[PDB]
Amino acid sequence: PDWNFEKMGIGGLDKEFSDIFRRAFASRVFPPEIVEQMGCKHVKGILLYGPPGCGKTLLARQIGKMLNAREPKVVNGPEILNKYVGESEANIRKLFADAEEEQRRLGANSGLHIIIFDEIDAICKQRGSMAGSTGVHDTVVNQLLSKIDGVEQLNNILVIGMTNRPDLIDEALLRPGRLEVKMEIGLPDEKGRLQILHIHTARMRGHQLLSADVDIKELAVETKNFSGAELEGLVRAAQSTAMNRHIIARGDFLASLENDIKPAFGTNQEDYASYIMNGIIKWGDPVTRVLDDGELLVQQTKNSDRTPLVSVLLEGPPHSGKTALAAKIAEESNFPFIKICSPDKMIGFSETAKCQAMKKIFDDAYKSQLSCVVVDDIERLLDYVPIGPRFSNLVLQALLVLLKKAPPQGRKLLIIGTTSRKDVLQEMEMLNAFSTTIHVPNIATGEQLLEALELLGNFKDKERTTIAQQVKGKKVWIGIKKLLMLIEMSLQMDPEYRVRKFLALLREEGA
Amino acid sequence: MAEDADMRNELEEMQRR
Numbered sequence: 001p002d003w004n005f006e007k008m009g010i011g012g013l014d015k016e017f018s019d020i021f022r023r024a025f026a027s028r029v030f031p032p033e034i035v036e037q038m039g040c041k042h043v044k045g046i047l048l049y050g051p052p053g054c055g056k057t058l059l060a061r062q063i064g065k066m067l068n069a070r071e072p073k074v075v076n077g078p079e080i081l082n083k084y085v086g087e088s089e090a091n092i093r094k095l096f097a098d099a100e101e102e103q104r105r106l107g108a109n110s111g112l113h114i115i116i117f118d119e120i121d122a123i124c125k126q127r128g129s130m131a132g133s134t135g136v137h138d139t140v141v142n143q144l145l146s147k148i149d150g151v152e153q154l155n156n157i158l159v160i161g162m163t164n165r166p167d168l169i170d171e172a173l174l175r176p177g178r179l180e181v182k183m184e185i186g187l188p189d190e191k192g193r194l195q196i197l198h199i200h201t202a203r204m205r206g207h208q209l210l211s212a213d214v215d216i217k218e219l220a221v222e223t224k225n226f227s228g229a230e231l232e233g234l235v236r237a238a239q240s241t242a243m244n245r246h247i248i249a250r251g252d253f254l255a256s257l258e259n260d261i262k263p264a265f266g267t268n269q270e271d272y273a274s275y276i277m278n279g280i281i282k283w284g285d286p287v288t289r290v291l292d293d294g295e296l297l298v299q300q301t302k303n304s305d306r307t308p309l310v311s312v313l314l315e316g317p318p319h320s321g322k323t324a325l326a327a328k329i330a331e332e333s334n335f336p337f338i339k340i341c342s343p344d345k346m347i348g349f350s351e352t353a354k355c356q357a358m359k360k361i362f363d364d365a366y367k368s369q370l371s372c373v374v375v376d377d378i379e380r381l382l383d384y385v386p387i388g389p390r391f392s393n394l395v396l397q398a399l400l401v402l403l404k405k406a407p408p409q410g411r412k413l414l415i416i417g418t419t420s421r422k423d424v425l426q427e428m429e430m431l432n433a434f435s436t437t438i439h440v441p442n443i444a445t446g447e448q449l450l451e452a453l454e455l456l457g458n459f460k461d462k463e464r465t466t467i468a469q470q471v472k473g474k475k476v477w478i479g480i481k482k483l484l485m486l487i488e489m490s491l492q493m494d495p496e497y498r499v500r501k502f503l504a505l506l507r508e509e510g511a
Numbered sequence: 512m513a514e515d516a517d518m519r520n521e522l523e524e525m526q527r528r
């Protein structure tokens with residue numbers, strides 16, 4: 001048995017590789033003297049799917065090495081498509097035909113000619129048959145499958161599909177015998193990542209470049225989610241800094257330094273700033289109780305087995321920093337996965353482009369264990385305007401089924417809307433689908449206002465005595481982003497006129 | 512796509528004199 005992962009090449013997926021070894025490839029390592037009786041035809045094809053950067057292409061070449069082909073030819077689907085119909089199918093035929101020569105020539109004792117597709121999922125979209133809308137590329141898949149299971153079948157072959165879209169694949173392509181068996185790869189657990197670090201480190205470990213103050217057992221877990229593809233780049237940076245250390249002129253961790261640089265597949269820390277410019281200024285009880293509620297129901301998911309999915313929206317009047325509050329609710333618990341979906345990046349897109357950007361984010365999130373996702377300015381991506389009712393029906397439909405769609409068993413997430421007006425949503429029946437709501441009252445009172453202004457510290461005791469004189473009495477209704485706006489607008493003034501400029505503008509807010 | 516281009520091409524004669 002040659003299938004042990006103490007061999008260095010790959011790791012972390014040991015159960016999944018074990019399964020394919022168990023039922024897929026057992027026939028090919030066995031004494032043939034037995035199996036020649038049973039006439040068991042080997043699996044011609046296999047599929048393995050998962051996220052991109054999780055180390056599948058070193059699985060494939062490594063199984064070829066395990067059971068030796070002449071060699072793999074690896075291809076990407078989009079690397080072959082041609083406008084001219086003949087070329088694409090011809091390319092595929094060339095790929096298979098490399099084997100057929102040996103098969104017919106040397107009969108049935110030939111070694112495997114192995115094929116790998118990097119992504120089929122573009123070429124193998126599921127065709128459907130009617131006079132219109134047959135499809136653009138619907139005739140390449142026919143050539144592929146006619147080679148796989150066709151007339152004058154060949155036993156000289158093995159083919160590994162790789163994809164990130166397992167649901168778009170045709171249903172006959174993966175029927176038993178054409179590709180019989182499917183496996184899932186998922187982004188590795190901490191055990192797998194400490195293995196991975198052992199792998200990519202093993203040369204440095206042998207050469208003893210990095211001798212001190214370095215522990216993989218802790219350094220694996222301090223990053224809760226990364227991609228095995230990304231870890232080799234991380235290790236490269238840790239090796240690169242010792243060489244960038246001698247720009248000044250035996251090895252150190254730089255991981256704690258560079259992890260902030262690294263964008264993950266998972267959580268990012270560099271998108272906060274735009275939503276949080278200034279951080280969270282607690283002006284009164286409502287702020288802290290709101291984010292206390294966020295910290296309250298985050299525990300709900302992580303400790304609940306019967307509510308994998310949960311959702312809220314922060315309603316309130318405009319310019320109350322609901323986006324920032326959602327961002328802070330995300331940041332407080334150090335989630336594995338946080339991500340924004342927003343019109344800032346979905347700008348200038350069609351109603352079916354922003355849906356397919358949003359579904360990408362969510363199906364990305366489904367495959368992490370625990371997650372928090374946030375949607376800001378619902379009205380914007382919903383493309384609402386009051387004059388006329390106008391919106392994209394597609395988007396809200398596709399948004400709320402996602403709010404009602406549970407992820408696979410054992411994975412959980414919460415969803416956070418920032419919608420600023422909910423009357424539309426109550427009439428348009430998204431509010432029964434949201435679990436519950438949060439009112440974010442903007443500041444209602446001057447006794448809290450001057451407190452907030454003290455926390456910011458723009459104005460002196462005299463300038464603030466002015467305010468304390470002018471309004472105790474009014475209940476001012478003001479969004480704080482507007483507060484920032486007009487304090488900065490009055491900050492440029494003749495200093496003598498500064499304060500009453502601010503006051504006069506503030507008294508134009510309405511209500 | 513929905514693309515059909517069917518095309519032709521021309522010969523460059525070899526010198527055998």
Ligand SMILES: Nc1ncnc2c1ncn2[C@@H]1O[C@H](COP(=O)(O)OP(=O)(O)OP(=O)(O)O)[C@@H](O)[C@H]1O
Pocket residue numbers: 275276277278279280281282283287317318319320321322323324325377420480481484
């Ligand atoms: N506790 C808080 N109360 C009020 N504002 C805050 C609080 N914490 C942060 N902010 C501020 O909120 C601002 C973010 O702007 P904001 O999200 O209100 O615009 P917006 O609400 O998205 O616009 P719109 O009202 O059109 O949705 C930042 O300046 C940030 O510092």
Ligand SMILES: Nc1ncnc2c1ncn2[C@@H]1O[C@H](COP(=O)(O)OP(=O)(O)O)[C@@H](O)[C@H]1O
Pocket residue numbers: 009010011012051052053054055056057058162196199228229232
């Ligand atoms: N044990 C491992 N587990 C996961 N990934 C690994 C492991 N060892 C190495 N890798 C990395 O996995 C990456 C796989 O990248 P590649 O297969 O080219 O893209 P994709 O995985 O999207 O097909 C390689 O770049 C390699 O550095």
